[PDB]
């Protein structure tokens, strides 16, 4: 597959990196620290859902929906990460601290997967656009 100017593939990798960062960094981060790397992970998502929203009109109406869904689904997953982040802050100093972090990771993770799912959902979408 030709990775010339497929904006979406790059943003994806970008995002996935951002998550991974967080994954490995959080172990060594202060409470104020989280907020930023999640912001990073938040931002890369904005670039993605951005480029995808432009590619959209040039797709089979069928897939056009299938994607807008995994789009709105992606948002629900970020929000869960944000929530699970706030928990980690007001519980930074408690015996609960160790779990919320896990949940934060799980959240960032499931966000990353659903991003890949968005990818494939667009690929197949492009395939059908060609068959036309």
């Amino acid at each position: 597959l030709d990775r010339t100017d497929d904006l979406v593939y790059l943003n994806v990798m970008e995002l996935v990196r951002a998550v991974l960062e967080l994954k490995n960094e959080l172990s060594q981060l202060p409470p104020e620290g989280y907020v930023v790397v999640v912001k990073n992970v938040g931002l890369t998502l904005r670039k993605l859902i951005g480029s995808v929203d432009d590619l959209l009109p040039s797709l089979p109406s069928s897939s056009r929906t299938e994607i807008e869904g995994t789009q709105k689904l992606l948002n629900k997953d970020l929000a869960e990460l944000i929530n699970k982040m706030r928990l980690a802050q007001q519980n930074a100093v408690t015996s609960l601290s160790e779990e919320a972090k896990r949940q934060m990771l799980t959240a960032s993770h499931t966000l990353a997967v659903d991003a890949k799912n968005l990818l494939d959902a667009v690929d197949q979408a492009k395939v059908l656009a060609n068959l036309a």
């Binding site: 912001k39 931002l43 904005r46 951005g50 789009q71 948002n75 970020l78 944000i82």
Partner: peptide
């Protein structure tokens, strides 16, 4: 609507 909802989540995080 997606972009909107998402942007909103961002503003929240930044504040």
């Amino acid at each position: 609507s997606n972009l909107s909802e998402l942007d909103r989540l961002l503003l929240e995080l930044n504040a």
